[model samples]
Target: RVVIGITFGNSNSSIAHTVDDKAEVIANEDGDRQIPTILSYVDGDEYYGQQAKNFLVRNPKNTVAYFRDILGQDFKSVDPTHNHASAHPQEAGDNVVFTIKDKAEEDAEPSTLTVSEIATRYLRRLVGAASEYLGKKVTSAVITIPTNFTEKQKAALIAAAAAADLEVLQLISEPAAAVLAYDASDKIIVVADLGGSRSDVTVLASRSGMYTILATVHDYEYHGIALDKVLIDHFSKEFLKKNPGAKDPRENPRSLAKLRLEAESTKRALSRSTNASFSVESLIDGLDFASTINRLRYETIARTVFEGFNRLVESAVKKAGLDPLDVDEVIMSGGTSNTPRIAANFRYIFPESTRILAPSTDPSALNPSELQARGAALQASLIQE
Candidate 1:
C-alpha cells in the first residue's frame, strides 16, 4: 500500500511517493513528472494531462486549461487569460461553465460542463496514474495548493478529490511543503516559489523539528507566464515590422498559440545560455516568424516582473517583523527558479548575510519542481498507520 502525494497547479501538476525512507516523483505514461494540467473532449470521449494538451494545437475549442482559476468563482470574475474564447465559457448561476464541441454529434449542440466537473475528471486521472505506478490502490493523498487559496476554493478542491475517490489526508501550502523538502531542521529561511503561473514568498521559523510560517506574500497575476507574454509581445512587434501587410499574428488564435509555445522554449533556453533564437513557421497566413534575443535584452523586457520578485521577498520579510539582514537562508523552489536572472535578483536583494539555496546548486537535493510533491508524500507516509 502506497501513500501518494500530489501537487496541484494551474499550469502543471505532479505526484510522488515514499520508499525506503526516501521520496521521489512518479512519472506519467509520457515519462514526464510534470503533468500538464489540461483536459480535452473528443468524439464523446475524454482525455487528460499530456494527451489533452496535444488537442490544443488542433482542437482548442474542445480543450480547457487553468480551470483552477475558475474554481469557486463566477464566470465574470475569472481571469481573461484562463477563459478560452473558442471554448465559449459562460456562467451557470455561480459556477463557471464551458461549452465544448461534441465531436460525436457533428451537427448537434455543443456539450456543456462546469469547471469543477473538468477538474474532477482530471483529478480522477491523476489518482489512476498514481495507483498504476505504485501497483496498489492509492486511497489517500496529501495535496499541496497555492498559499492564497480561499476557504471556498479549498473546499472545492477537497470536493474534487472526493469525486476522484481519493481521501484528502492534508492540504499543505506550497511554500511550506517546499520547506519540508529542503530538510533544514532549525533554520530561519524564506521560501520563494516561482512556477509557470504564479509566485509565492513565505517566511518560516524552524526549531528542533517543528516549523512555523510567519508571513507570506503571493502574486497571482505574475510569474513565468507573464514573462512569456512579454516575449510574445516583443516577437509580435518584430513580425509586424517585417510584414506590414499581414494581419497581426497576436490577433489570430493559431498564430498566437504557436508563438506562445515557442516563447516557453526560448525562455528556458535563455535561462541556460546567453542567447536564444525564437522562430515559428506559418505563424500567420503562411508567414513565418524568426528573431534572436540576448540575455541582456530579455532581462530588460522582463524588468518589471523581476522587480516584483524582489518586492515580494522584501514584503514577506517585513510582514514577519524581521530585518532583511535577519534572514538566515533563502530557499528557491519551483521550475522558474532555474532562470539565471531570477537567481541573480535574489543575490542582489539578500546578499552578504542570507545564503540562497537551490536544487540544482545543491548536489544532494531533488529537483525543485518535484520537491513539494516529495515533501507531501513524505508527510503522508508518516501519517499513514
Candidate 2:
C-alpha cells in the first residue's frame, strides 16, 4: 500500500504516490516536481535534480547529463552532443561511461562511472524525496518507460532501480500511463509527448484494461530546447541591439546557462499567460537584462517547432492507418505539452470529435508532466491486490 510510482524521461523525471485514492506528484527538496534528470559531483559532495543542474554552469566536468540515453546502448551508438557541456559519455570497451571528478581532494583523480551507477545514484535521490515527503520508508514503485524501450534497456533500468535500494513493482509504457491518468478506456487515443530535447507520438488502443500501441513516431529535433533556443536567440539579439557591443551570453558558459534557464521559465510563464517577462541579472558583463514576449509572438517564432509536433501526431495516426478523426482522444504528455500553442496545434490537427486532454483544452486534465507518474501510481495500486 506504500508503493510509489516513477516516470523516467530522457531529460527529466517525476515521482508520484496514491493519496486518498488520488495520484499526487511528489516534489523534491527544491519543491520541483519536474526535476531534471541530472546529477553533479562537486568536491566529493553530490547534488541531484535542480541543484545538480545548476552546477552545470560551475562544474560541467563533474556533472553528468543525458546518462539515460547511454543506458544499454553501445558506446559508439550513443550521441554525446547533449552531454557536451557536462561529463560526456566515453567508450569503455563496449559500454558507455563518464569520467567525473568525484573526490574532494584537489589532487584526487577522476572516477570512471557507468550509466548504471549514475542512474542508481539519481534514482536514490528520487526515492529519497518521496520517502521524505510521505514520512515513510518507501521501497517499491512502478516505473514508466517510452513505447520503444528495448528489452536490454528494460533490463538495464531494472538493474539500476534495484541497485538504488528500490523494488520496481512493474514497468509501464509512458503513453499507457498518460492515458491511465485520465481514467479512460476502450478508446483509440493519440499520445504526443513534447519533451525537452525531443518529441514522441504514440497511437494507442485502450481496450478493457489492456493498452495496444498501434504506431509510434519520434524525432530528435524541434522540442522544448528548440523553443528555448528561439527565445535565447531572440533575447541575445535584443541584448546586443541595446548594448551595442556588450559580451554575448551565448559565447560564455555561465551566461548561456543563465540565459537558457531564464528562457525556460519564460516559456513556462507563457504557457498560462498571453505574455511573459524575461530577466537575467548580470546576464553579460555586469548588465541586468530584461525583456518581454507575448504568447502570440512566441508562438509565431516557434511556428516550425509547433508544426513539427503536429506533423508527428498526424504522422503517428496515419501510420496506424487512421485519420485524425479516428483518434477518439488526444492526451498530451511530457513537460513541453503544457505550452498552450502546442495544445492549440493539436486542436488544429484533430477534428472537434477528437477530445484533447490538456490544460489549455480541458480544465480537468491532469498535469501533462505528471501524467505518467500518476498513471503508474494507479497501476501500482491495481497490482497491490
Candidate 3:
C-alpha cells in the first residue's frame, strides 16, 4: 500500500509521492503533469482530465468543469455564470445540483448529481490514475486546499474523497504546504497563489515549526483563466485578420474549444520564454492558424489582471496590519506565478530587502506547480512510518 499527495486545485489537479525519501510529481497516463480537474461523459462512458475538457465541445451537457467551488454551497448562494455553457446547476432543496444527459439513449431521463457527487467522481479518477502510475495501491492522501475554504467546504471535500475510497491523511493549507516544500527559515512571508480559477494571497508568520496565517485574500475574477482568455482572444483575432472568410472561433464551439486548449499552452509557454507561438489544426474552416505573441503584448493586453494581482497582495499585507517592510520573503506558490512578469511587477512593491522566490528568480525554489504535492508527499512519508 502507498500513500499519495494530491493537490486538487479547483481548475487543475496533481499527484505526487515520496521516492527514496524525496518527493516527485506523478504524471498521468496522458503524460500531463498539470491535469485539468474536469470530468465529462460520452454516452455513459466517463472521461477525466484533458479528455474531459474536450467534451466541452462535443458533449457540453454532460461535461462538468468549475464545479469544485460550488461544493457545500447553497444553490441560491452560487453563481452558475461559468456553467452557462455546460449543464447548468439548479437548486435541489437548497443543494446545488446539475442535471445532465449521461445515458446512452438521448431520450433517457437526465441524471441529477450534487456538486459534491461530481467532486467524488473526479477524485476517483484522479486516484485511479495515480495508482496506475505508482504501480501500487493508493488508499490514502494528504490533500492540499486553498486557505479560504470554509469549514463546510472542507468537510465536503473530505467526504467527497472518502467516497472515492481515499482516506484523508491530512488537509493542509496552501501556504503551509509551500513552507514545508521549501523548508525555509522562520520568517514573515507572503504567499501569492495566482491559480487558474482564483487568485489567493496569504500572509503567514512562520515560526517555531508552526505556521500562522496572518491575512489571506482571494478573488475569483482576477485569475490565471482571465490570462488564458486574453491569449484566446488575441490569437482568435489574429486568425481572423489573416483569413477574413474563416469562421470566427468565438462563434464556433468546436473551434473555440481547440482555441482554448492552444491558448492555455501559449499562456504557459510565455511564462518562461519572452515569446510563444500558437498553432491550431483547422481552427476555423480549412485555416490552420499560426500566430506569435511576445510577452510585452501579453502583459499589456491583460494589464488589469496583472496589476490587480499586485494590488491584491498589497491588500493582504495591509490586512495583516503589516507594511511591505515587514514581509521578509514572498513565495510565488501556484502555476500562474510561473509568469516572470508577475515577479517583475512585485519588484516595485516589495523593498530591495525582501526576497522573491520563484522558479526563474530563485534557483532553489521548488516549481510552483509541484510545491504543494511535494510538501504533502513529504508529510505523507513522515506519517507513514
Candidate 4:
C-alpha cells in the first residue's frame, strides 16, 4: 500500500505518489494525468472523468461540474444554473443536498444525496482508479486545497476523504505545494496561479529548506472560467450573425453547454497558435456554428480580463509590501500560465532585474499542471517517513 497525493480543483483533479524516492504523478486508466472534476448520474449508474464530461453533450441536466465551488456554501449561494443542471441542490441546514434522479427509478421521485456524499463518491472513484493503476492499495493521502478554503470547507474535505476510505495524512495549500515543485532557493518568490475557476497570487520566502508565506491574494471571480465566458460571448455573437433565426446561445442550455466546451478548447488553441478555428455542428436548433479567431481578436475579447490580471498582480505585490526589484523571481503555475500573454504581462509589471519563470523554464523537472499534486506527494512521503 502507498500513500498518494491528490490535488482537487474545481475544474480538474490529479493524483500522484512518491516512488523510489522520487515523486511522480500517476495517470488514470486512460493514461491521462488530469481527470475532469465532473460527474453524471444516469440509468441506475454514475459516471466520472471524461466519460461523465462527454455525457454533458447529450444529458446536461444530469451532469454536475464545479461542485467544489458550491461545497460549504449556503445552498442559495450557488448559481441557479448549476443548481438546475445537477439534481438541484437544496438547503440542508448549514449544509446542502442534491436532489438527483434515483438510479433505480429514473422516472420516479428523485433521490437525495448530500454535497459531501457526492464528493465522497467522486473521491472514492478517483482513489479506486489510482489503486488499479498502481496495482496496490492506497489508503492514505495528502490532499491539496485552495489557500482560501475556510476551516469548514477543509473539514468537509477531510470528511469526504474518510468516506472514500482514505486516511488524511495532511492538507497543504495549493501555493505552498507549487513552491515545492518549483525547487526555489532561499529567496522571496511570488506564485501567480491562474487556474480554471480561480486565481491565487501568493508571496512566500524560502529559507534553509523551509517555506513561509508572506502574503496571499486571490479572487475566485478572476479565473480561467471568466476568460472562457468572454470567448463564449464573442463566439455566440458570431454564431448569431451566421444563423439569424437561431436562438441566443446564451439563453439556450444545450447551445450554451456546447459553446462552453468549444470556448475552453479555443482558449487553449489560441495560447499556442496565432489563429484558431471553432466548429460545432448543430450548436443550436440544428444550426451549425463556425468561426476563425486570431490572437489579436482573442486578445481584444480578453482585454478586460487582462486588465484585471494587471490589477491582481499589483495587488499581490502591494499586499506583500515588497518592491518588484526586491523580489528574487516570479513563478507561474497552473494551466492558464501556458498562455503567452500571461507571462508577457507579468514581465511588463515586474522590474527587469527580477526573473519571471514559467513551467517551461524547467520542463524536464516539473509539470506545471501536476505541480500541486507532486508537492502533495512529496509531503505525503515525508509524513509517512
Candidate 5:
C-alpha cells in the first residue's frame, strides 16, 4: 500500500510529499520535493505549478490562476480578484452569487461548470507532476481540505480527484494531517494552518498513530487575502488617481492581472522590510513610485491577522479546554506565516507556547511551502494502502 498527500490551498496548488526513514523530501520533480501549484490557462492551452506562476505574471490577459475561491460554487460564480468581494455577476442560485467587477459583457451567460472543475484542474496538475516524478502509473492518493469544508465540498473534491485520474483513499482535514505528520510524543496537538486565503485551527490528541480531533475551524474573513486587499486598494487608489486618463486599471484585464501578482509580491516583501517598492510604470503610465511602510504602521493596518486568527486561536484553546499557555506546540503552515512580525505577535499572545515548525524527521518538514503538499502526499499514500 502507498499514500500521497496533496492540497489546492489558497496561495498554491499541486504540492506533494514523500516519507523517508527520518524525514520527508518534496517527492516530485528535480528532487527539489516542492513545486508551486500554480496553474495558467488560456483558450489555447494550460500550464501548471511553478512554471505557470511565472508565465501568468507576464501573460495576464490569457491566464487564470488560483480559482479555488470559486470551488463548490457555480462556475458562473464571481471570484474576487483584488477586492474583498468579486465583481463577477452571479446567477440567482441557492447561494449568494456576487457580481464580478469586469467589463466583458453586461449579460454574459454564466457557465454551468462549478468550482469543482477548478479544484480538479488544480489537483490533476499535482497528480500529473507526481506520476511523472515516481516514474510509475500511480492509482490511488489522499487529499486534504480545510476543516470547514462541507460534505458537499468534500464530495466535490472527491469528484475532482477522480477527474484528475486519482483514486481517493481518504479525505482528511489539514490540521489532522499536520498532527499525523508531526505528533510523536504529543500531550496536546494544536495545528494552525495559515494559508494565503484562509486560516484554520484544529486541536487533537495523537496516540499510537491515531489523531483524535478536539476542534476545527476555517475562516477567510481575516486571512492573507484580506491583508492583500488593504494593500491593493491603497496602491490602486494612488496609481489610478495619478493616471486619471491612462485607463481604468480594473477595466484593463491584462494590467489588473499583473497588478494582482505584483501587488502580492510587494505585500510579501513588506512583511519583512520596512517599505514596499512596486514597479508598474510599464503597466500604468505615470505611476512610478516607492512607498515606505514601517513595521508598526504595517502592523497597525495589517493587525487583522493578529485580531482575527488570534480569535480563532483562542476559540480553539477554549474548545480544547486548555489555556493558551497549556498548548504544547503551535504548528504553523501557509505562505502568510512568512511574515517576520507574525511570529512575534503569536509569541506575545501566547508567551508560553512554542511555534511548531515541521518535524525534523519529516523530510518535507514544516515549511510554509511544503506542509500541505507533504501532508497531501502522505494522505494519498494512505488511501492507496
Candidate 6:
C-alpha cells in the first residue's frame, strides 16, 4: 500500500507519498492523489472536479470552488455580498439568508459551515478514500501551510484537521518543503513563491537529510494580482478618455470590474509570450469593445511588478547576509512564476556561478500549490509509518 501526503493551501493542492520503494509521485484519480481537491456538491452526495470547475456557472447554487481561502472559523472579514454569485460564499457564511428558485427562508444555521469546516470535510473524505483503499486506518497526515500564516490561523488549521479525524504531523512551510524536495545538497538555493495574495523569497542550504532555510521574506504589497491590476487600470484609462463623460467614465465600477477579468486573462495568456490579446464590451458607448496587447506593452505593464519582486529578493538576500553570487540554485515555483518575464527577472538577479533549478516535474519540487501538500504527506508518512 502507498502512504499519502496532503498539501492543503489557498491556491491549488496535491497529495503524494512514497510507495513500493519508488520515488514519490502525485496522487490522482488512478493513484493516491485522487480528486485534486476540486470539489462541488450536487444535491447532497454527488461531487465533481475538472468538470465542476468548467460547468460551475450552470449550477451556481450547487457548485463550489476555492474552499481553502475560507476554511475555519467565522468569516468576519469577507463581505458575503462581495461574493453573492458563488455557491461557496453562500454555503460558508453563518446565519446566512438566501433565495432559491423564488423561495427564501432562514434555517436553524447550516450544518455545512465556514471555509475551514468545508475544507476539513473534504480532507476527511480524501483520507477515507485512501484508508479504505489501503486497508489501514490512514490517520496520520502532514499539512502544508503558507509562510505568513499567523499563529491563530495555524491553530485553526490543526483544529480543523483534527475534526476531520487525522493525526497531525509537523506543519511545514511551503518554501522549505520545496527546497527539501529539490534535494540539491551543498547548494545555496533561492526559491520564489508567487501566489494569489503574496510573493515570498527564501534562501536555503540544501543538505543530505534536511533542508535548512537560511532566510525567508514575503511581500503583500504587490504580486500577480497587482500585475493584473496594472493591465486593467491601463485599459480603463484609455477606454474612459475616449468615451468622454462629464465624470471620468472609469468611475463606473462595473465597467472596471469587467475589464479587470479581461486583463487577468490576458496576463495569463502572456505567460507564454511577450504579447496577449483581450477584449472589452461596450467600453466607448457605441463601439464594440476589443483590443490586442502586444508583448512589449505587457512587459511595460509588468515593469513595476518586476521591480517589486526584485526589491523583495534584495531584502531576502540582505537578510540572509549573502549576495546574489552566493546563491547556488534558484528555484521558481507557483503558477504565477510561469510568466516568462517574471521568471527572467529571477534569473537575472542571480550570479552566473549559481545554478538555478528550473521548475521541475519532480512531484515534490516547485508545484507551488501542491509542493507543500505533497511534502506534508511525505513527512507524515515518515513519522506514522
- The predictions' CA RMSDs to the true structure, in order, are 2.2, 1.4, 2.0, 2.1, 5.6, 5.9
Global Cα lDDT for candidate 3: 0.86
lDDT for each residue of candidate 5 in 1-385, tens digit (9 for 90 to 100):
4345666665665445465622254455533344555545444366666556666546443334445555565544445543232223235555423322123434554333334554566677677666677666667766777777667667777887888777788777777666555534646667777777678888877666677878776676777777776776666677777666666665565566566667777887876577777666566554454444555666776776567877887898898787876776667667676666665656666655445454331244456555665666665554444
Error of 6 at 269 (Å): 2.2
Model 1 TM-score, all chains together = 0.92
Indicate which candidate wins on TM-score.
2
Cα shift from native, residue 261, model 4 (Å): 0.5
Worst 10 residues of 5 by lDDT: 96-105
Model 4 misplacement above 4 A: 74-87, 359-365
Q: What are the Cα lDDT values of the candidates?
A: 0.82, 0.88, 0.86, 0.81, 0.61, 0.62
Clashes (N, CA, C under 3 Å) per candidate: 0, 0, 0, 0, 31, 12
Per-residue error (Å), model 2, residue 203: 0.5
Cα lDDT tens digits, model 6, 1-385, are 3346666644346666666532254544545342434455544444444444433444456444545545533456444432333453643235222222211223322344556655666677667656766667776766777766777678878887888888677788888766555543467777887765567888877676557778889776667768877887777666656555523434554454456457777987877666677786554354545667887787886798888888887888889999888887777766567666765676677766866554431233344444555556556666766
Best by lDDT: 2
Candidate 4 has what TM-score?
A: 0.93
**In model 1, which range of ten residues has the least summed lDDT?**
358-367
Ten-residue stretch with the least lDDT total in model 2: 67-76
Q: lDDT per residue, candidate 3, 1-385, as tens digits? A: 4799888987889998998988999999999888888889888888999999877877888888888788877677788766766778888886788887778876888889888889998899899999998777789999998877789989999999989899998999877887778865678999988888788899999788778999999898888878988888888888888887777888987787788778988988888788989998877677798878898888899898899898899999999999999998898988998888888888778998898888766667778888888888888888898
Off by over 4 Å in 5: 1-3, 22-40, 50-66, 69-114, 207-209, 237-256, 270-276, 290-297, 353-365, 379-385
Candidate 4, residues 64-131: lDDT per residue as tens digits?
Answer: 77788676666766764444544566787877877766476746786677888888989998998889
Mind giving the per-residue lDDT tens digits that candidate 2 earns over 320-377? 9998888999999899998887787788778898998998798788789889989998
